[PDB]
Structures are given as structure tokens and as C-alpha cells.
């Protein structure tokens, strides 16, 4: 049932660990073989993520070793403040360091996971009322900006919170997440990338995006970090409206999921074979769909509805995209994408998709839920 399938990403992951050795994956470009860095992107949380699951799966010490350098590298990178100027410390730190003390309460992560929370929370403009996506303070075009993506780094602030009784967190929490609600989320459901507010008075600007199709579009991975985020936020902040949001998109996104079950690249472009794919969209939405039944009481048919269309999401990319740990494929599931708009990856592996599609699985199978809250929240 998912024992098979988890069982072609753990192969996968040990091999790659080795291979790999300190370096970090991000995406493939043309090959089966995993583009690497030295823990420069925004990316390099999925990894730690990764080899976090695999040994909580496992309980392979293999996996943990590996999961405890990217820790240390990560002490590093937040040491010499490298290529952290951005909202992504949460999708860093959530996955490698918070997951850490998650995993087996190490007080060096905890510290590390929390400093990393501290950096964030500077990122939030008291005057925009929002959390600096990417860009220096008062960027001249990027200051006042926010990228649906940034409600997965809200957990990070959320967690620091309730372990700090520090209630700044919380109240920037909210306020970012109600604030993409309200003007990333569209009137049909659907939602833009990003939306611009002035960086003086903090009034709204506009809505767009340079990764959808167009300003107007339904980029699919966006999509897919609303549903997730915003039944993640829901979670930590017991917010009832988040949740419906979280609910009314992923009916959105469901209804327009292509015959073999995995979505294009944008709900927009032409929804036929020729077009690009995204199965990390897929891989998030599983994980989002999980999310929000967990949420749910068993009188609400609906919860079981979401949970049969998680299930038959993760059986789609199972069938259709995962790779059989055939000793030189890196990645867990292909068609993934980049930037079709830039012609950067538009059809490979993407470290974070998956991560999300690990994290479906054992949710599935374990029915172990991540790192972007205490177990049991
Ligand atoms: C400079 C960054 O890396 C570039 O590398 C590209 C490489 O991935 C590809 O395989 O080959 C290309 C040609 O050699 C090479 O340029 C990428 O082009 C990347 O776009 C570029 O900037 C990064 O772009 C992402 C996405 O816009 C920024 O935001 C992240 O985006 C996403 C997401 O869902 O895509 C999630 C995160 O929340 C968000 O921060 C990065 O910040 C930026 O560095």
C-alpha cells in the first residue's frame, strides 16, 4: 500500500547521503541526478526534512547522522548570517533544527531553531504590516511584499511563541496570515503568488506574481502552500476562518486536478499533456489535505472526503512519477518544476517536493506529521 513506496525513498536516501556527504540537494536540471549546494538556498530545510522522516521511519542511525550535520551546518549558516535575509528561515530551521528537538528534544536545536525565529521576526515591517518576503528592509521594489509561500514560515514564529511564552510571535503570526487571506486569496478561491503593499502606509497595492503564468493566474504550487499554510496556521492559532480558506482552496485545486491526477505547472496555461507539470504542487497538497481533516470531526463527511482525495493524490504520484530506487535515480518523484517561466527546471526533481511526498506517506503509513509543530498540537 505506501510500505513499497517508502520503501524506493529510503533506498533512494541512503544512497544519496552518501553521495551527497555534507552538501545539500535542491533540483535536478535535465538528469536524475540532484543539482547540490553547500547550504546557499532556500531549500536546504527539505533534506534535513528528509533525513529526519527516514529515521523516524526507520530509527536507522544512518539517517539521523546525516539529519544532525545538516544541523550543524545550519548553526553555521545562521552564525555567518549567510543568505538568510529572506522569509524562508522557517522552511530552513523548521525542517532541520526545530525538527531536531521535535525528533529527540536536543537543547542545541531548540537554541538554534529559536535564534533562527529571532532573525525572522525582524523581518516583519511594523508599518506593512507583513512579513518581508525576500529582499533587504525597504528594498526598493521588494519591501513591502508577500509570497503565499511565506505562510509555511509562520510555524517557526508560532513554535518560538509557545516555547518563549514571548506572545510577539503570535500577534506577527496572525497578523501576516490573516493579511494573505485577505489579499492573496481570490474571490473564486484561487489565490495570487504574491501581493505588494506600500512599504510607507502599508496600503495595498496590488496582487502578482514572476513564477505564475500571469499576475491573474493559479500557479498550482501556490495554490498548494495556501491549502497547506493556511491549515497550518489554523492549527497554531486555532483560527476558524483560516481553516475555511484553507478548505474552500483545496476544493478549488481538487476540482481541477488533469485525468492522471497530478496538476500542471498553472491552473491557467493550456491543461493538456504538452503543458508542464508540477507533481510538488500535488506532493503539498496531500500533505495540506492531511492537515485539514486532522482539523475536522468525524461527523464532517467532508473530512473523509479529504482524506480519500490525500490518498489518491499520493497513489497518482506513486503510479505516474515516483522513481524505483534503481540504484541511480536521486529523486523520489519526477515532473516536478522550478520556474517554467524562466525554462529553469521546468521537469525535474524538486528537493521539497519530495519531502512533501515523504511527509504524505508517513502520515499515511505512521501517520507522523512533520516538523512545523510539536507532535501533537
Ligand atoms: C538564484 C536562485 O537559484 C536559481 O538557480 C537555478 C537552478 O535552480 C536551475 O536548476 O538552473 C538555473 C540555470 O542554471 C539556475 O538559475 C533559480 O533560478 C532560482 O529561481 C533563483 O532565485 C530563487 O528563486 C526562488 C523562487 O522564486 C526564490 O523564492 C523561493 O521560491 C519558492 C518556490 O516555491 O519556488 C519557495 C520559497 O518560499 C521562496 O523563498 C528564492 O528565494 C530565490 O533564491
Redesign the pocket.
Known amino acids: 500500500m505506501w510500505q513499497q513506496a517508502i520503501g524506493d525513498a529510503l533506498g533512494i536516501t541512503a544512497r544519496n547521503l552518501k553521495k551527497f556527504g555534507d552538501r545539500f540537494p ?4 535535465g538528469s536524475n541526478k540532484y ?1 547540490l549546494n553547500d547550504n546557499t ?3 536546504d530545510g527539505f533534506w534535513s526534512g528528509i533525513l529526519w522522516l527516514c529515521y523516524e521511519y526507520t530509527g536507522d542511525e544512518q539517517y539521523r547522522e546525516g539529519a544532525v550535520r545538516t544541523v550543524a551546518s545550519f548553526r553555521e549558516r545562521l552564525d555567518r548570517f549567510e ?1 538568510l535575509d ?3 528561515i522557517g ?1 530552513l530551521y523548521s525542517l532541520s533544527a526545530k525538527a531536531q528537538w521535535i525528533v529527540e528534544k536536543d537543547e542545541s536545536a531548540r537554541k538554534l531553531a529559536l535564534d533562527a525565529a529571532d532573525v525572522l521576526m525582524r523581518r516583519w515591517r511594523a508599518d506593512a504590516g507583513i512579513i518581508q ?2 529582499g533587504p528592509k525597504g528594498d526598493p521594489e521588494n519591501g513591502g511584499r508577500i ?1 503565499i ?2 505562510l ?2 509562520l510555524p517557526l514564529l508560532l513554535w518560538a511563541g509557545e516555547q518563549t511564552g514571548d506572545p510577539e510571535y503570535r500577534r506577527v503570526a496572525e497578523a501576516h496570515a490573516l493579511k494573505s487571506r485577505r489579499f492573496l486569496v481570490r474571490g473564486d478561491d484561487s489565490s495570487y503568488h504574491t501581493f505588494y503593499f506600500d512599504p510607507e502606509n502599508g496600503n495595498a497595492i496590488r496582487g502578482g506574481t ?2 505564475g503564468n500571469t499576475d491573474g493566474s493559479t500557479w498550482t ?2 495554490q498548494a ?1 495556501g491549502i497547506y499554510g493556511f491549515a497550518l496556521n489554523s492549527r497554531y492559532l486555532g483560527n476558524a476562518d483560516l481553516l475555511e480558506t484553507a478548505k474552500r482552496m483545496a476544493r478549488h485545486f481538487l476540482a481541477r486536478v488533469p485525468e492522471d491526477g497530478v496538476v500542471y505547472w498553472d491552473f491557467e496555461v493550456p491543461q493538456e499533456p504538452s503543458s508542464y507539470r508540477d507533481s ?1 504542487a500535488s506532493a503539498i497538497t496531500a500533505c495540506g489535505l492531511l492537515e485539514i481533516a486532522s482539523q475536522l470531526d468525524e461527523s464532517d463527511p467532508e473530512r473523509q472526503r479529504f482524506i480519500d482525495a490525500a490518498k489518491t493524490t499520493v497513489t497518482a504520484l506513486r503510479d505516474g512519477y515516483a522513481e524505483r530506487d534503481d540504484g541511480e535515480a536521486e529523486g523520489f518523484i519526477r515532473r516536478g518544476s ?2 517554467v517561466r ?4 521546468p521537469d ?1 526533481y ?1 528537493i ?1 517536493g519530495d519531502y512533501y511526498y515523504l511527509e504524505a506517506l508517513l502520515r499515511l503509513e505512521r501517520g507522523v506529521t512533520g516538523y512545523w509543530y510539536e507532535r501533537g498540537r
Open positions: 535542491h533540483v535536478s536540471d543539482v538556498d532556500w531549500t543568505n529572506h522569509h524562508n522552511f518576503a525576500w509570497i509561500d511565506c509555511l514560515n514572476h513564477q504550487r501556490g502552500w510538488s522550478y520556474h524562466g525554462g529553469i527546471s525535474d524538486t521539497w
